[PDB]
């Protein structure tokens, strides 16, 4: 129905190419998954880093719902951490600019 079959928009080294996508209130920013885990399974960090990147914005001023995850450093599972192209990550709070 949406996103899932891509693993392809936003390259880096490690990553497979992964693009999330970061909103606040409608507010989007394209955001890549976090490399240095197997490219497939982000990093506790990447959920909290999305959203976070996306704007430039500390972890306290958002607050990241996507993928069932919450931002934080480490908070859940990383196999679930949006293993598709970066996956999706919205914060509702501020991106502060």
């Given at each position: ?15 497979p ?6 909103t606040?209130?409608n ?6 998954v ?5 490219n ?6 990447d959920?909290?880093q ?10 306290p ?9 919450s931002?934080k ?5 990383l196999?679930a ?11 509702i709070g501020?991106?502060?600019n």
């Amino acid at each position: 129905m949406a996103k899932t079959e891509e693993m392809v928009q936003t390259e880096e080294m490690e990553t497979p190419r992964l693009s999330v996508i970061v909103t606040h209130s409608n507010e989007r920013y394209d955001l890549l998954v976090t490399p240095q885990q197997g490219n497939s399974e982000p990093v506790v960090q990447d959920l909290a880093q999305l959203v976070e990147e996306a704007t430039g914005v500390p972890l306290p001023f958002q607050k990241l719902i996507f993928k069932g995850k919450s931002l934080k450093e480490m908070e859940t599972p990383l196999s679930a951490l949006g293993m598709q192209n970066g996956c999706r990550v919205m914060l509702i709070g501020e991106k502060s600019n």
